[PDB]
Symmetry: C5
Subunit: 114 residues, 5 copies
């Protein structure tokens, strides 16, 4: 697996507009909401769950990086894997997307896989 696998999904020129932290089934988790910097389109929501899925090792790295990009409001590319989370109320509140990477986008193209 890799953040950059073409089977994952990514969204360029976004900003992190919201951040949530909680716990589910003994695991810490966080979720972020992103929107296009220019205001177009609809939001992207993605979560990371510390004890769960092949992406679990990156939970702290992703949380720390999400917090920094959230604090700056700088443009980013968000990378997700769709259709991972399953608890229906959790998915309906947030989404089934697993957060799998974050790329800064301060130049012409975002610094990450495409």
């Amino acid at each position: 697996e890799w953040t950059g696998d073409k089977t994952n999904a990514y969204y360029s020129d976004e900003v992190i507009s919201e951040l949530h932290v909680g716990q589910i089934d003994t695991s810490p988790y966080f979720c972020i909401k992103t929107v296009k910097a220019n205001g177009s389109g609809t939001p992207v929501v993605a979560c990371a769950v510390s004890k769960q899925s092949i992406w679990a090792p990156s939970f702290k790295e992703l949380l720390d990086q999400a917090r920094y990009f959230y604090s700056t409001g700088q443009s980013v590319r968000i990378h997700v894997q769709k259709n991972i989370w399953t608890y229906p109320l959790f998915v309906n509140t947030f989404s089934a997307n697993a957060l799998v990477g974050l790329s800064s986008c301060s130049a012409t193209q975002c610094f990450g896989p495409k």
Copy 2:
């Protein structure tokens, strides 16, 4: 269990106004006080205690997040489970509420579980 369980309680548009760190019964803990951004109501107090209660795994995550939101003073939704801490002097000083989640808020919507 989940932050967003309907048996938990939450309060929207709160500002984290105070922060305390201490130790109780072998465990570091922290408590926060929150007040309505609009100045109404009565404060909410909640604590997290390392290695105690079902919420223990998220102690460090919630401490770091509480510190950040305390530093910005931004309006948040605070999620708690009531009647978790039982040490009576602790409860009298703070509350029995276990902190179980924190959500940022726009002016119209907080980003977290509700209803």
Copy 3:
């Protein structure tokens, strides 16, 4: 044991004015000095030692919180237990007070045991 135990001591309306980190007998430790926000009174010195005293479990959390309050300079209530550290040269450089809690304050009141 609890930060708020009557057998501990506390000082309100203080600012953390100095910070020191070191090691003793294989244990990292730190010390802080505090002074009244208004300039009155006598300084308070306390230390936490990572592997020593009943307060060992709280070392990292108090170090992180001390650094935060040190960096803001805001008014705090410092909680200590007297007569804990015993190495004479250490006590004479710093004091025998163990740091056991830190509470934020406003003008007339602080958020913590009293």
Copy 4:
């Protein structure tokens, strides 16, 4: 092995201008891009992968330092080992450079091996 070995390569007077976090083959990783402070030259890209290469032990310290230098925008010397990463889509997105050190730079010199 040492950051300073002559079989590594380094580039002075650089600024970290992009940062990416992800995961590959169960390992958290991050990449940075640096550009000369004065606008000359070609960008340098390097990545650290949490449990791969002889440089695995310094992953966390170099991620934290990369983040610090990125946030200040100060001039640094970046130390890499060339030709380490091998997954082609990863190398072509980023590079084969392993990140092995970061040194702050003044006007005329940098604080690190050279």
Copy 5:
């Protein structure tokens, strides 16, 4: 052992002026250069090496504190133990000093062993 042992060396009224992070012999390490706040004297250099020397337990505490004092540029006292690192190329690049403590300094005094 103690930061404050008389067999150690300290230098007061210093500013941390450079910071370097790398890896040696499986150990992440950092070094700092300090110079007098008033611009006099010759610089001091000291390193901390993750799982090396009696001072290893304090590596993370000292790295976090060095980073903070580096970021503010405030006057500090640096405490070292001489003649610890033995690799000659490493010593020649940096020094044999082990960093063993850091103390904030006011205009009047420094908060640490003397």
